[PDB]
């Protein structure tokens, strides 16, 4: 009666969405770029190896220097390394070992952390003392830790296992804002370049953008067929890449509201796992749970490139902000740093 | 000159890397432990008897560390974080048997899925028939009926390597015994020699279990290093 | 959009028949293992009926062997349930839910609160 009749006002909604999206869809990406000169053969070769940690790599994220970044690994340890000279910097044993995400501060002077414990636990590295030691631990999420991401050395905003997002106050502790969207657990977040939006995907196949200063879900992107592990904006924060267990990528549109391409292959039948842009945002690069890197033509959805060292499942990578090089964490406990 | 700083972040490299060896050491001795029991099949009391997103618990077996780690306030969908666990010595699995009236019938789909998960392939498990003292009450009662929630038991016989308890009447050798081949059903079915599966009858109050656990992951050890040498 | 609607369902008298629908839509149907999921009034959801994605594999819950068939066509995107002989422990809400990921042999969560590939479910009600 009353339910059912919500469900139906729900039908006639998506359906004026899908009609909406449809009437915009006047031209593919295909055919706007099949004139393009493709990229060719992007063959990176393995620049360096890092072998500190002992368990697998869950995660990884480069400084904005483009020199230092900081791993996670399941033996319970942060690494901050030195990818010109492979020293490490800093060797941060963690409370809980099933950290599963971590984040390097723009400004430098802060790593996150986070996994099953459902805390993200910030470490000062700027301490007028020398050590690391735990500056924060926000306590505030009902399941574990997928993602984080620093807006500055105050903001921080995490990704959950409890299907919500959450905007924190790092000085107090508490949670600013929380996102309520989702209904699966989200598992990846990707900060718009002026960091005024953010966008997410979960495991309910739909990839939302959320407002930080607002707190509201502006748009709501579906088309993929399984859970959304991996997320990463466009350069210009006008689109977004996404890795789904469905052994697609697929880009999508803020203006258009809908997405823009497909990458996929037929002999591709294993889950992304990663995902990031280059500096011109030409080049989309996955992991895949084969073990290997895939990269593709973000304008022409070809592949242009495999990245095939790692010895198990890669489970992370970034490029970094001078787009100079790519480092790729996997399963086999090794960051390689790809140019 | 800029060299010595060069030497000052290669003095912090070594610093760094005498320290991980020592981590390594205790890291590589420490057998760690998923205890992925059911709700309400005595899971919570198999830990008693020794907010936060997981629980911890060490104890040691002839000087062997274990770590077994118990999954707490997170949610029922377990195909993200289950994925954490795929190189643990092994998942321990406890199931209430007497929890049939179909609570039996979401622990044998729950092991399929961890049986047959991509990453768990390589994981073994130690199964914990639980609440044995409570199934043997259930039938030498009356109208349970077995054979309601599942039909095939009608047409099941105590096979012979059965090892029946002293005392006990054969109809609770025959039920806690079918309810063991329901769950060797599903791991003889996919094992590929990589994994193996380890079913004990216990109850929430067994001082076995712990040293259950110490033999179980003991062979598997052993498997594990007679397959390095491709003996088994 | 993945999107599961079951049809059919209903008042059926004891010992009646019926076949329960489900239009999948969404995803690409013949890489699917398709499930049926039951909640009866006050109970929790469980497992009814599982089959493969190419159709051969077929397995049922105890409480159900020998009077419900599971079938699927992969050419028509749909997952069908004949239910034959009901009885009135059948009352339930039948729900066609989709296993997670493509091409995978095991199958989490299909009966979770909240997962997300399944279908709203029909009403299915066996009392004379």
């Known amino acids: 009666s009353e339910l059912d009749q919500l469900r139906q006002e729900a039908e006639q909604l998506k359906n004026q969405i899908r009609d909406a999206r449809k009437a915009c869809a006047d031209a593919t990406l295909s055919q706007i770029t099949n004139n393009i000169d493709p990229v060719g053969r992007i063959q990176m070769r393995t620049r360096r190896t890092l072998r500190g940690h002992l368990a697998k790599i869950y995660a990884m994220h480069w400084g904005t220097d483009s020199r230092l970044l900081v791993s996670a690994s399941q033996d319970g340890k942060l690494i901050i390394w030195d990818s010109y000279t492979t020293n490490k910097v800093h060797a941060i044993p963690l409370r809980s070992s099933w950290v599963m995400t971590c984040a390097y501060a723009p400004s430098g002077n802060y790593v996150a952390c986070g996994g099953l414990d459902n805390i993200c636990s910030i470490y000062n590295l700027k301490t007028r003392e020398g050590n690391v030691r735990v500056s924060r631990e926000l306590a505030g999420h009902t399941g574990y830790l997928s993602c984080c991401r620093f807006l500055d050395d105050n903001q921080i905003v995490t990704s959950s296992g409890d299907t919500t997002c959450a905007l924190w106050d790092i000085e107090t502790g508490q949670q600013t804002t929380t996102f309520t969207g989702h209904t699966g657990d989200v598992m990846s977040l990707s900060l718009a370049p002026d960091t005024r939006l953010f966008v997410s995907g979960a495991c309910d196949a739909s990839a939302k953008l959320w407002d930080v200063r607002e707190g509201m879900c502006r748009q709501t992107f579906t088309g993929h067929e399984s859970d959304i592990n991996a997320i990463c904006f466009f350069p210009n924060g006008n689109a977004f890449a996404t890795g789904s267990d469905d052994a697609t990528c697929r880009l999508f549109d803020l203006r258009a509201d809908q997405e823009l391409m497909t990458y996929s292959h037929d002999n591709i039948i294993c889950g992304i796992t990663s995902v990031s842009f280059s500096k011109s945002g030409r080049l989309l690069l996955a992991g895949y749970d084969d073990f290997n890197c895939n990269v593709w033509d973000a304008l022409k959805a070809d592949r242009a490139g495999v990245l095939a060292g790692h010895d198990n499942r890669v489970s992370c990578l970034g490029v970094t902000d001078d787009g100079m090089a790519v480092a790729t964490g996997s399963w086999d406990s090794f960051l390689k740093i790809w140019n | 000159d800029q060299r010595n700083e060069e030497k000052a972040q290669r003095e912090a490299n070594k610093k760094i890397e005498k320290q991980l060896q020592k981590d390594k050491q205790v890291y590589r001795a420490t057998h760690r432990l998923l205890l992925l029991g059911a709700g309400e099949s005595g899971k919570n009391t198999i830990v008693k008897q020794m907010t936060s997103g997981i629980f911890e618990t060490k104890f040691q077996v002839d000087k062997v560390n274990f770590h077994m780690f118990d999954v707490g306030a997170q949610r029922d969908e377990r195909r993200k974080w289950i994925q954490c666990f795929n190189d643990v010595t092994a998942i321990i699995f406890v199931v209430a048997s007497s929890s049939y009236n179909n609570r039996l019938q979401a622990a044998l789909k729950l092991f399929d899925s961890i049986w047959n998960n991509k990453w768990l392939r390589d994981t073994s498990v130690i199964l914990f028939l639980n609440k044995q003292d409570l199934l043997a009450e259930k039938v030498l009662a009356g109208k349970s009926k077995i054979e309601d929630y599942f039909p095939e038991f009608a047409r099941y016989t105590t096979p012979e390597d059965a090892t029946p308890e002293p005392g006990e009447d054969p109809r609770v050798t025959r039920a806690k015994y079918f309810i063991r081949d329901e769950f060797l059903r599903i791991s003889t079915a996919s094992g590929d020699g990589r994994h193996y599966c380890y079913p004990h009858f216990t109850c929430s109050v067994d001082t076995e279990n712990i040293r259950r656990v110490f033999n179980d992951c003991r062979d598997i050890i052993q498997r594990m290093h007679l397959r390095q040498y491709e003996l088994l | 959009q993945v999107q599961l609607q079951e049809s059919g369902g209903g008042l059926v008298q004891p010992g009646g028949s019926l076949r329960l629908s489900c239009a999948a839509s969404?995803?690409?149907?013949?890489?699917?293992?398709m499930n049926w999921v039951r909640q009866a009034p006050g109970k929790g959801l469980e497992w009814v009926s599982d089959?493969?994605?190419?159709?051969?594999?077929?397995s049922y819950t105890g409480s159900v062997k020998g009077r419900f068939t599971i079938s699927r066509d992969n050419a028509k995107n749909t997952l069908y349930l004949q239910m034959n002989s009901l009885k009135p422990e059948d009352t339930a809400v039948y729900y066609c839910?989709?296993?997670?990921?493509?091409?995978?042999?095991?199958?989490?969560?299909?009966?979770?609160?909240?997962?997300?590939?399944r279908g709203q479910g029909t009403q299915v009600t066996v009392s004379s």
């Open positions: 969404g995803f690409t149907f013949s890489n699917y293992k």
């Open positions: 839910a989709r296993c997670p990921a493509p091409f995978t042999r095991d199958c989490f969560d299909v009966t979770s609160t909240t997962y997300a590939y």
């Open positions: 089959i493969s994605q190419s159709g051969a594999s077929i």
